[PDB]
């Protein structure tokens with residue numbers, strides 16, 4: 039049974055609601071982005087209309103084998119009519135193809151569904167600038183002040199500098215980056231670029247990256263692992279055992295591994311600054327956990343909501359416990375009293 043916070047009132051629309059069977063009343067299923075918790079339930083035998091970005095559409099077709107007749111890609115930043123209702127897709131600053139959706143209801147109500155997003159001041163000059171939003175369905179992943187982390191630019195600067203130093207000191211070192219979904223591609227792309235290398239990966243991960251409309255992608259990635267000194271592996275293999283095993287396969291070409299595990303927030307954010315971050319080391323293998331987030335920090339979220347001044351907020355993350363729900367409701371009231379809406 040589909041939960042209330044995935045239904046759009048006054049419409050036949052659901053958002054990220056593919057694991058509940060045939061939802062009664064739903065004429066169009068929107069998909070904000072290609073992450074498994076959100077697409078859960080979609081497969082090649084789906085037979086209702088799916089509305090999404092072009093990039094999400096590419097992934098549905100090629101990775102999940104959803105038939106072409108049911109995929110409805112929409113351009114960004116463009117007023118579109120779907121089943122008699124005006125909608126707009128906006129960039130979410132999440133993973134490739136991720137969108138927020140603006141719905142202009144027949145009765146005059148305006149609803150923004152953020153999907154998953156990393157709020158940014160640039161959103162204050164999108165098509166949101168114009169007008170009033172009555173209901174906000176909000177990605178509240180990190181809605182508590184303890185959730186701090188650096189900008190994506192600061193994290194990438196650290197990764198580039200760390201990798202360039204290590205390989206200039208030891209030209210026989212291999213760099214490895216963990217992945218388990220789309221998103222955070224800048225980490226491995228920026229490291230490979232500083233090292234003058236393509237990024238090597240499995241056939242399955244290459245296929246995924248070929249769906250993302252990244253400019254000049256054929257110049258940046260490869261399935262030929264031997265030609266590359268930056269490799270991608272599943273996140274699960276980024277540990278001393280898995281990396282030891284990988285180094286064996288490389289045919290005495292390398293004598294050191296430097297590995298990166300992009301995480302979200304971890305409690306080491308509460309003590310250590312990005313500049314002060316150190317790896318876990320065993321012999322000739324070192325592993326860095328780096329806090330590269332594709333969700334809003336608490337401060338970024340607060341800024342966005344205080345700018346938008348929505349009449350009602352509906353959280354879409356951390357809704358499963360009374361304590362979490364109460365905590366979020368308290369912050370929403372603080373933000374409203376401070377800003378005066």
Ligand SMILES: Fc1ccc(CNC[C@H]2CCCO2)cc1
Pocket residue numbers: 178179180181182184185356362365366
């Ligand atoms: F949005 C929320 C609000 C509250 C919580 C509960 N845990 C928060 C604690 C542990 C880690 C940092 O503070 C989770 C998500």
Ligand code: NI
Pocket residue numbers: 071073132154
């Ligand atoms: Ni996501």
